[PDB]
Short mmCIF file of all heavy atoms in Angstrom, two decimals:
data_model
loop_
_atom_site.label_atom_id
_atom_site.label_comp_id
_atom_site.label_asym_id
_atom_site.label_seq_id
_atom_site.Cartn_x
_atom_site.Cartn_y
_atom_site.Cartn_z
N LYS B 1 4.51 -0.39 16.22
CA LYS B 1 3.54 -1.45 15.96
C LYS B 1 2.58 -1.01 14.85
O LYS B 1 2.60 0.15 14.40
CB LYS B 1 2.74 -1.82 17.24
CG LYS B 1 3.57 -2.25 18.46
CD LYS B 1 2.68 -2.79 19.60
CE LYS B 1 2.02 -4.14 19.25
NZ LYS B 1 1.14 -4.63 20.33
N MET B 2 1.72 -1.95 14.47
CA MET B 2 0.80 -1.82 13.34
C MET B 2 -0.38 -2.77 13.52
O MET B 2 -0.36 -3.63 14.41
CB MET B 2 1.53 -2.13 12.00
CG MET B 2 2.12 -3.55 11.88
SD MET B 2 2.90 -3.83 10.27
CE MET B 2 3.44 -5.53 10.44
N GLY B 3 -1.41 -2.64 12.68
CA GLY B 3 -2.58 -3.51 12.77
C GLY B 3 -3.37 -3.56 11.48
O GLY B 3 -2.77 -3.50 10.38
N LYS B 4 -4.70 -3.67 11.62
CA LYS B 4 -5.66 -3.90 10.52
C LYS B 4 -5.44 -2.91 9.37
O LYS B 4 -5.58 -1.69 9.55
CB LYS B 4 -7.10 -3.77 11.05
CG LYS B 4 -7.48 -4.76 12.17
CD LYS B 4 -8.92 -4.54 12.67
CE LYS B 4 -9.15 -3.13 13.26
NZ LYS B 4 -10.57 -2.90 13.64
N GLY B 5 -5.07 -3.45 8.21
CA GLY B 5 -4.83 -2.67 7.02
C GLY B 5 -4.37 -3.53 5.87
O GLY B 5 -4.21 -4.75 6.03
N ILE B 6 -4.12 -2.90 4.72
CA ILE B 6 -3.91 -3.62 3.46
C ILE B 6 -2.79 -2.95 2.63
O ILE B 6 -2.51 -1.74 2.77
CB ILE B 6 -5.28 -3.70 2.66
CG1 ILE B 6 -5.13 -4.57 1.37
CG2 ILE B 6 -5.85 -2.30 2.34
CD1 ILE B 6 -6.42 -4.76 0.59
N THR B 7 -2.14 -3.79 1.81
CA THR B 7 -1.10 -3.41 0.85
C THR B 7 -1.73 -3.24 -0.55
O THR B 7 -2.56 -4.06 -0.99
CB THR B 7 0.01 -4.51 0.81
OG1 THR B 7 -0.61 -5.80 0.71
CG2 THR B 7 0.91 -4.49 2.06
N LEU B 8 -1.31 -2.18 -1.24
CA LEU B 8 -1.80 -1.77 -2.56
C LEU B 8 -0.59 -1.46 -3.44
O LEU B 8 0.32 -0.75 -3.01
CB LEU B 8 -2.70 -0.48 -2.45
CG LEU B 8 -3.95 -0.57 -1.52
CD1 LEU B 8 -4.70 0.78 -1.48
CD2 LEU B 8 -4.88 -1.73 -1.92
N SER B 9 -0.60 -1.94 -4.68
CA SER B 9 0.47 -1.69 -5.66
C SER B 9 0.20 -0.34 -6.34
O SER B 9 -0.87 0.23 -6.14
CB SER B 9 0.51 -2.82 -6.70
OG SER B 9 0.63 -4.08 -6.06
N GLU B 10 1.17 0.18 -7.12
CA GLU B 10 0.97 1.45 -7.86
C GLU B 10 -0.20 1.35 -8.84
O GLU B 10 -0.95 2.32 -9.01
CB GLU B 10 2.27 1.90 -8.58
CG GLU B 10 3.51 2.01 -7.65
CD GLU B 10 4.59 2.98 -8.15
OE1 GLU B 10 5.06 2.81 -9.30
OE2 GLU B 10 4.97 3.92 -7.42
N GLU B 11 -0.37 0.15 -9.44
CA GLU B 11 -1.49 -0.18 -10.34
C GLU B 11 -2.84 -0.08 -9.62
O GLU B 11 -3.76 0.62 -10.07
CB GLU B 11 -1.30 -1.63 -10.90
CG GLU B 11 0.02 -1.83 -11.67
CD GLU B 11 0.25 -3.28 -12.10
OE1 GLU B 11 0.78 -4.07 -11.28
OE2 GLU B 11 -0.10 -3.64 -13.24
N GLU B 12 -2.93 -0.77 -8.47
CA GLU B 12 -4.18 -0.96 -7.70
C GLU B 12 -4.62 0.36 -7.04
O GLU B 12 -5.79 0.76 -7.12
CB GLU B 12 -3.96 -2.06 -6.63
CG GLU B 12 -3.38 -3.36 -7.23
CD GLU B 12 -3.06 -4.45 -6.19
OE1 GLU B 12 -2.42 -4.15 -5.17
OE2 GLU B 12 -3.42 -5.61 -6.40
N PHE B 13 -3.65 1.03 -6.40
CA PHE B 13 -3.83 2.36 -5.83
C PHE B 13 -4.10 3.39 -6.94
O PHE B 13 -4.78 4.39 -6.70
CB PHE B 13 -2.57 2.75 -5.02
CG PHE B 13 -2.68 4.08 -4.28
CD1 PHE B 13 -3.37 4.16 -3.08
CD2 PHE B 13 -2.12 5.24 -4.80
CE1 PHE B 13 -3.48 5.36 -2.41
CE2 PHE B 13 -2.23 6.44 -4.13
CZ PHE B 13 -2.91 6.50 -2.94
N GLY B 14 -3.53 3.15 -8.14
CA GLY B 14 -3.86 3.93 -9.32
C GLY B 14 -5.35 3.87 -9.64
O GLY B 14 -5.98 4.91 -9.84
N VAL B 15 -5.91 2.63 -9.63
CA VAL B 15 -7.35 2.39 -9.81
C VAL B 15 -8.16 3.11 -8.71
O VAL B 15 -9.23 3.67 -9.00
CB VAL B 15 -7.69 0.85 -9.80
CG1 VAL B 15 -9.21 0.59 -9.93
CG2 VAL B 15 -6.92 0.11 -10.92
N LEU B 16 -7.63 3.11 -7.46
CA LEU B 16 -8.27 3.80 -6.33
C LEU B 16 -8.40 5.31 -6.64
O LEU B 16 -9.48 5.86 -6.56
CB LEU B 16 -7.46 3.58 -5.02
CG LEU B 16 -8.15 4.01 -3.68
CD1 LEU B 16 -9.30 3.06 -3.31
CD2 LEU B 16 -7.12 4.11 -2.53
N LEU B 17 -7.27 5.94 -7.05
CA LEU B 17 -7.20 7.38 -7.41
C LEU B 17 -8.19 7.75 -8.53
O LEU B 17 -8.84 8.80 -8.48
CB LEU B 17 -5.77 7.74 -7.88
CG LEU B 17 -4.64 7.65 -6.81
CD1 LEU B 17 -3.25 7.95 -7.42
CD2 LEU B 17 -4.94 8.59 -5.62
N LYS B 18 -8.24 6.88 -9.55
CA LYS B 18 -9.09 7.03 -10.75
C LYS B 18 -10.57 7.08 -10.36
O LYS B 18 -11.26 8.08 -10.62
CB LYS B 18 -8.82 5.85 -11.72
CG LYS B 18 -7.45 5.91 -12.45
CD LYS B 18 -6.99 4.53 -12.99
CE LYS B 18 -8.06 3.80 -13.83
NZ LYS B 18 -8.49 4.59 -15.00
N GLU B 19 -11.02 6.01 -9.71
CA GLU B 19 -12.42 5.80 -9.36
C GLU B 19 -12.90 6.79 -8.27
O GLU B 19 -14.02 7.28 -8.35
CB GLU B 19 -12.61 4.33 -8.92
CG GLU B 19 -12.34 3.29 -10.03
CD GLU B 19 -13.38 3.33 -11.16
OE1 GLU B 19 -14.44 2.68 -11.02
OE2 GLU B 19 -13.16 4.03 -12.18
N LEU B 20 -12.03 7.09 -7.28
CA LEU B 20 -12.33 8.12 -6.25
C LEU B 20 -12.48 9.49 -6.91
O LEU B 20 -13.42 10.23 -6.59
CB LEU B 20 -11.22 8.19 -5.15
CG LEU B 20 -11.11 6.96 -4.21
CD1 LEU B 20 -10.01 7.16 -3.15
CD2 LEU B 20 -12.45 6.63 -3.54
N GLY B 21 -11.56 9.79 -7.84
CA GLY B 21 -11.58 11.03 -8.60
C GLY B 21 -12.86 11.20 -9.41
O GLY B 21 -13.37 12.31 -9.54
N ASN B 22 -13.36 10.06 -9.95
CA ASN B 22 -14.64 10.00 -10.68
C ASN B 22 -15.80 10.36 -9.72
O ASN B 22 -16.49 11.34 -9.94
CB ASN B 22 -14.88 8.59 -11.31
CG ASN B 22 -13.87 8.23 -12.41
OD1 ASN B 22 -13.38 9.10 -13.13
ND2 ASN B 22 -13.58 6.95 -12.55
N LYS B 23 -15.96 9.52 -8.66
CA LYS B 23 -16.95 9.71 -7.55
C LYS B 23 -17.03 11.14 -6.97
O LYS B 23 -18.08 11.54 -6.47
CB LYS B 23 -16.67 8.72 -6.39
CG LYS B 23 -16.73 7.25 -6.83
CD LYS B 23 -16.37 6.28 -5.69
CE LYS B 23 -16.16 4.86 -6.21
NZ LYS B 23 -17.30 4.37 -7.02
N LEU B 24 -15.91 11.90 -7.04
CA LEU B 24 -15.87 13.32 -6.61
C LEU B 24 -16.80 14.24 -7.45
O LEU B 24 -17.00 15.40 -7.09
CB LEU B 24 -14.41 13.86 -6.58
CG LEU B 24 -13.50 13.28 -5.45
CD1 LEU B 24 -12.06 13.82 -5.55
CD2 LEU B 24 -14.11 13.57 -4.05
N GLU B 25 -17.39 13.71 -8.55
CA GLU B 25 -18.42 14.43 -9.34
C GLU B 25 -19.69 14.61 -8.48
O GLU B 25 -20.36 15.64 -8.53
CB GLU B 25 -18.74 13.66 -10.66
CG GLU B 25 -19.40 12.27 -10.48
CD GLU B 25 -19.59 11.52 -11.80
OE1 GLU B 25 -20.37 11.98 -12.65
OE2 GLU B 25 -18.94 10.47 -12.01
N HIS B 26 -19.99 13.55 -7.71
CA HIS B 26 -21.02 13.56 -6.69
C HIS B 26 -20.48 14.33 -5.46
O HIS B 26 -19.92 13.73 -4.53
CB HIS B 26 -21.42 12.09 -6.35
CG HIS B 26 -22.53 11.96 -5.35
ND1 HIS B 26 -23.85 12.12 -5.69
CD2 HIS B 26 -22.51 11.66 -4.04
CE1 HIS B 26 -24.60 11.93 -4.62
NE2 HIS B 26 -23.81 11.65 -3.61
N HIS B 27 -20.59 15.67 -5.54
CA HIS B 27 -20.20 16.58 -4.45
C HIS B 27 -21.15 16.41 -3.27
O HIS B 27 -22.23 17.02 -3.23
CB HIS B 27 -20.19 18.06 -4.93
CG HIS B 27 -19.03 18.45 -5.82
ND1 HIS B 27 -18.12 19.43 -5.48
CD2 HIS B 27 -18.66 18.01 -7.04
CE1 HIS B 27 -17.25 19.58 -6.45
NE2 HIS B 27 -17.55 18.73 -7.41
N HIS B 28 -20.79 15.52 -2.34
CA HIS B 28 -21.50 15.33 -1.08
C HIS B 28 -20.49 15.48 0.05
O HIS B 28 -19.52 14.71 0.11
CB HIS B 28 -22.19 13.95 -1.02
CG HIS B 28 -22.91 13.70 0.28
ND1 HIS B 28 -22.47 12.81 1.23
CD2 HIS B 28 -24.02 14.27 0.79
CE1 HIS B 28 -23.28 12.84 2.27
NE2 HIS B 28 -24.23 13.71 2.02
N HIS B 29 -20.71 16.49 0.92
CA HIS B 29 -19.82 16.75 2.04
C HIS B 29 -19.91 15.58 3.04
O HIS B 29 -21.00 15.20 3.50
CB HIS B 29 -20.13 18.11 2.74
CG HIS B 29 -21.41 18.18 3.56
ND1 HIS B 29 -21.41 18.41 4.92
CD2 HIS B 29 -22.70 18.04 3.21
CE1 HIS B 29 -22.66 18.43 5.35
NE2 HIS B 29 -23.46 18.21 4.33
N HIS B 30 -18.75 14.98 3.29
CA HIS B 30 -18.59 13.96 4.32
C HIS B 30 -18.55 14.66 5.68
O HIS B 30 -18.13 15.82 5.77
CB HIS B 30 -17.30 13.13 4.07
CG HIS B 30 -17.29 12.44 2.73
ND1 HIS B 30 -17.62 11.11 2.57
CD2 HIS B 30 -17.00 12.90 1.49
CE1 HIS B 30 -17.56 10.80 1.30
NE2 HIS B 30 -17.18 11.86 0.62
N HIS B 31 -19.01 13.98 6.72
CA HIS B 31 -19.16 14.56 8.06
C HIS B 31 -17.82 14.42 8.83
O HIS B 31 -17.02 15.39 8.83
CB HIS B 31 -20.35 13.89 8.79
CG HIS B 31 -21.66 14.02 8.04
ND1 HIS B 31 -22.10 13.08 7.15
CD2 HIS B 31 -22.59 15.01 8.03
CE1 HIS B 31 -23.24 13.47 6.62
NE2 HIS B 31 -23.56 14.64 7.14
#
């Protein structure tokens, strides 16, 4: 089974990788 979630293309997930990779400049440890 499966539930709440979303589909992402190589393009869209590419944008996710890019922008997340950028945000990693702000080194803040997540809990």
